[model samples]
Target chain A: MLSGLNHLTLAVSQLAPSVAFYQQLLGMTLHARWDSGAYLSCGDLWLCLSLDPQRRVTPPEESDYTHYAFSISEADFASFAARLEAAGVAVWKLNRSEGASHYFLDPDGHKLELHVGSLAQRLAACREQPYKGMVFFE
Target chain B: MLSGLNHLTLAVSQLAPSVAFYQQLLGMTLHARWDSGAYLSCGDLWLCLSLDPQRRVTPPEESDYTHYAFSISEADFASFAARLEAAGVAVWKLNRSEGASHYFLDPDGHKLELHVGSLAQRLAACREQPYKGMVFFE
Candidate 1:
């Protein structure tokens, strides 16, 4: 059976700036660095940035809700959002559910979220006020 | 500080088939599902499949190497790869690095991989024979 996630590889046009964005702003530690690729770790997540010059040239589809959401401590949530604001990254979506979530796009236009909650908490909120046709598996 | 991944939300055109694909083929557990979205859990990883009608109609970039890689137990690696082949999903890329890896696309054409090693093992292999310009962070 598939156990868990080992890592995520993202194509990047600019390797150095992307690396700096993740390492400096997100607080991920640099693990390995090479010319075309580099690896960084955030908590247990290993994020790989693969260099590619034609990543965001193609326009992304509208209404694509796909994104990678990072788990963040409540203590750092405010500061993190502020840093992103200070960095001038535009907010992509607004949170409408329980707990806090900051939806925004990365430098390469990949959707990302900094969520300060868990699945259990989301399920708990769903139980109280579920979405239309909502059903729980557990 | 920003922590590890909380969850990943993927936009899918067909909700039911994608749900079945993840649940039956990948052995992920369905958590909470609704009309527009469904949440599935693979080990500690939270995966959400959101409904979208226009995900792949717009052609993706040519050199995009972005992908999500799941960790698989060495004991089940061969069988998992066989099962994927049996399911008619073509191998996107063959393993060329230290440990076993299966690169394929999901039902929505989102690239996915199953890697059979940890960060530590990859680093150990790097120590013996590093990639071009590879340097360890520690």
Candidate 2:
């Protein structure tokens, strides 16, 4: 039912720097390693980084703002922000309204949000029903 | 090092439709199913397609464009282009000058690409003699 994503691949101009950025900036775990690429994880989510040297780069044209998001508990947001700022990273704004509050960009101009919320809120949300019975249908 | 990526996440407003698009259009495999979300796969990569009823409720001006990309073989480019057109998907453009080719955009304005060539070229370039004596003192 092609109901989920496979993995998100990033076309990086440089292999090692982008690797360092995501690793140090976010506490993502390196999941897989390839000769020309590497894999990192946050929980069960996978983000693959692929390097391209002769890349035809794109200009900073405003995109639809559908940046990739990763969910983080409310507890982790503060320390995460602190760590990034301490490293002298450029942080636009830290948000805390919806759940965990903050947004940051990866080395490749990808925007990521670390959402904060309670475990009870999460469990209840899932307990309601998977896909509300829509996924099972043809 | 917390390097590489395991998975990437896309928070979708309409879970059902997005699921259908990935499943029907892209030759991806679905492995995990849930009430509010699902996990999908392409080759060895995995992705989580999560749903939020309050999704897309936020104005675009407030979000970011951390673009996500994917790689495809040269042979698959034409077929991908055809299916996308038949599905009423608008591909951004064809990138041919970069010693490869690609197109962009997906549901929710997410930027996708069908780039050819693997990471071989860049790795070879790095081994050139110009880097033979480089050392890090930091």
Candidate 3:
């Protein structure tokens, strides 16, 4: 019924800043980019940034939906945030409990939280493998 | 310093059906598996379906992160939702003005929204692009 995730979309107020942020901060490669937006490769998946000044007003619920997070590793967390600050990227503290974190807004004003160690701790307990869904095997 | 997106963790309650639902419906291949949880994937990104029975007791704020829309073609939306319904996927409505959508949850209670339309439409109006605090190729 459903296919694998084709792309994850982010509605940005502006496109260039977000594009530059991910590119420099995460070292994301530009895969396919367009006029108002672009797609950056974060591993095999594409973190797509699309712009719509009309997004908040359009369909009416975009802003109400707010932000989401993309998890990162404990090893590289510092370098990523540092790069953002170095580039003058708007960086904010991610979490108090989970030290060493940062938050930033893309050109579109959508907030993204980058953190490490939440799931890694959970996965450590179960060394067993995960169930592969249809997309992987076939 | 970053490798790529290794996983997209989702907190859910039950294991069997979420495993079955993602496997059959989305075709996410199994990367690893366990009784307490399951990890499913598409391409390189793993969707970690973690079991969170204590989900009910947690404060709403501390529970699920924000929701997001999974992009799909108009061709597959109907049949996809139908299959989810058949599998007893918890579906809700997200009524966008341009297209229609429904929300569902994996076993751990994270909200999943599936939406139609490509991201290309919104990426084309910008006259410039941002790069490390400098506008590039504008």
TM-score of each: 0.94, 0.51, 0.49
lDDT of 3 by residue, A2-116 (tens): 4445456666666676777778656777755566666676654557676656443223122221233556678777787777778776543344422334666554455555656
Fnat measured on candidate 3: 0.18
| Structural RMSD, model 2 | 8.8
- Backbone clash count for every predicted candidate, in the order shown: 0, 24, 25
- Residue B107, candidate 3: Cα error in Å is 3.7
Expressed as tens digits, the lDDT of each residue in A1-138 for candidate 1 is: 888888988888888888888998778999898878888988999898998766773333444777999999889899899999999977888898788899977778788899998888888889899999998886
**What ranking of all candidate models by TM-score puts the best one first?**
1, 2, 3
Native contact fraction per model:
0.90, 0.09, 0.18
Predicted candidate 2 versus true structure: per-residue lDDT over B28-129, tens digit per residue? 666545666766666544556777554453332332323444566567667876777788876555564343544555565555555554334433443342
Candidate 1 stretches with Cα past 4 Å from truth are: A57-63, B57-63
Tens digits of per-residue lDDT, candidate 1, B55-106, equal 6633333437788999998899988888899999756677565367888778
Which ten residues in a row are the worst by lDDT in model 1 chain A? Answer: A54-63
DockQ, structure candidate 3: 0.15
DockQ preference between candidates 1 and 3, better one: 1
Off by over 4 Å in 2: A1-138, B57-65, B122-138
Better of 1 and 2 by DockQ: 1
Q: Which ten residues in a row have the lowest lDDT in candidate 3 chain B?
A: B129-138
Docking class for candidate 3: incorrect
Q: What is the full ranking by lDDT, best candidate first?
A: 1, 3, 2
- How would you encode candidate 2's per-residue C-alpha lDDT over A1-138 as one tens digit per residue? 112332466767676777788765677765444546666665544566776553333322332233455665456667876777788765444544334446666665555555554333433444554344323221
